[PDB]
mmCIF file of C-alpha atoms in Angstrom:
data_model
loop_
_atom_site.group_PDB
_atom_site.id
_atom_site.type_symbol
_atom_site.label_atom_id
_atom_site.label_comp_id
_atom_site.label_asym_id
_atom_site.label_seq_id
_atom_site.Cartn_x
_atom_site.Cartn_y
_atom_site.Cartn_z
ATOM 1 C CA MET A 1 8.344 18.768 10.292
ATOM 2 C CA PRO A 2 8.814 16.107 7.573
ATOM 3 C CA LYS A 3 6.824 16.244 4.332
ATOM 4 C CA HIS A 4 5.267 13.228 2.620
ATOM 5 C CA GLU A 5 4.119 13.156 -1.000
ATOM 6 C CA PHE A 6 1.682 10.540 -2.281
ATOM 7 C CA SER A 7 0.432 9.983 -5.832
ATOM 8 C CA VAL A 8 -3.312 9.342 -5.987
ATOM 9 C CA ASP A 9 -5.542 9.415 -9.063
ATOM 10 C CA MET A 10 -8.743 11.258 -8.194
ATOM 11 C CA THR A 11 -11.638 8.999 -9.159
ATOM 12 C CA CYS A 12 -14.329 10.188 -6.758
ATOM 13 C CA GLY A 13 -13.596 13.913 -7.096
ATOM 14 C CA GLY A 14 -16.876 14.414 -5.247
ATOM 15 C CA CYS A 15 -16.280 11.608 -2.742
ATOM 16 C CA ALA A 16 -12.486 11.375 -3.009
ATOM 17 C CA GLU A 17 -12.376 15.019 -1.936
ATOM 18 C CA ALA A 18 -14.613 14.397 1.070
ATOM 19 C CA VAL A 19 -12.471 11.369 1.890
ATOM 20 C CA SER A 20 -9.483 13.672 2.373
ATOM 21 C CA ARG A 21 -11.324 15.335 5.260
ATOM 22 C CA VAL A 22 -11.225 12.071 7.225
ATOM 23 C CA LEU A 23 -7.427 12.270 6.953
ATOM 24 C CA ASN A 24 -7.403 14.820 9.767
ATOM 25 C CA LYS A 25 -8.434 12.007 12.112
ATOM 26 C CA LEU A 26 -5.691 9.659 10.905
ATOM 27 C CA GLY A 27 -3.120 12.409 10.404
ATOM 28 C CA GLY A 28 -4.534 15.519 12.058
ATOM 29 C CA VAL A 29 -1.689 17.431 10.429
ATOM 30 C CA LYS A 30 -1.289 20.013 7.678
ATOM 31 C CA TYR A 31 -2.520 18.799 4.295
ATOM 32 C CA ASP A 32 -3.159 20.303 0.855
ATOM 33 C CA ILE A 33 -5.520 19.167 -1.906
ATOM 34 C CA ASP A 34 -4.832 20.455 -5.421
ATOM 35 C CA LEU A 35 -7.207 18.984 -8.001
ATOM 36 C CA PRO A 36 -5.615 20.930 -10.897
ATOM 37 C CA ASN A 37 -2.320 19.226 -10.061
ATOM 38 C CA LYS A 38 -3.904 15.954 -8.941
ATOM 39 C CA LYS A 39 -1.322 15.849 -6.161
ATOM 40 C CA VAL A 40 -1.596 15.882 -2.376
ATOM 41 C CA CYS A 41 1.205 17.152 -0.147
ATOM 42 C CA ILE A 42 0.821 16.512 3.577
ATOM 43 C CA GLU A 43 3.312 16.963 6.393
ATOM 44 C CA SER A 44 2.812 14.559 9.283
ATOM 45 C CA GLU A 45 4.782 13.446 12.316
ATOM 46 C CA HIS A 46 4.257 9.837 11.246
ATOM 47 C CA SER A 47 4.242 9.844 7.451
ATOM 48 C CA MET A 48 3.601 6.632 5.526
ATOM 49 C CA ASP A 49 0.390 5.632 7.288
ATOM 50 C CA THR A 50 -2.034 8.561 7.168
ATOM 51 C CA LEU A 51 -1.945 9.094 3.392
ATOM 52 C CA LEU A 52 -2.509 5.477 2.331
ATOM 53 C CA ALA A 53 -5.498 4.963 4.633
ATOM 54 C CA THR A 54 -7.172 8.176 3.462
ATOM 55 C CA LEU A 55 -6.262 7.878 -0.217
ATOM 56 C CA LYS A 56 -7.382 4.247 -0.458
ATOM 57 C CA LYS A 57 -10.523 5.115 1.517
ATOM 58 C CA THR A 58 -12.427 5.994 -1.661
ATOM 59 C CA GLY A 59 -10.688 3.072 -3.364
ATOM 60 C CA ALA A 60 -8.546 5.555 -5.275
ATOM 61 C CA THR A 61 -5.173 4.382 -6.568
ATOM 62 C CA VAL A 62 -2.326 5.161 -4.175
ATOM 63 C CA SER A 63 1.382 5.305 -4.997
ATOM 64 C CA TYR A 64 4.141 6.443 -2.644
ATOM 65 C CA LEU A 65 6.868 8.327 -4.509
ATOM 66 C CA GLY A 66 8.954 8.601 -1.347
ATOM 67 C CA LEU A 67 9.303 10.845 1.703
ATOM 68 C CA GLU A 68 12.140 12.835 3.261
#
């Protein structure tokens, strides 16, 4: 159960948040959305593929800090 952390600046709070929902399809794994921290921590069996697609979906900036 590896964890992947991605840095994304919420621009479409309203839409960017809804965009995260689509991640379940790409990832379908456990994910957490913390606006107050502006950070998203998701654990996937693939990692480095589900986050980028979802994060960039709303055209929000995406930066990979690294994964286990």
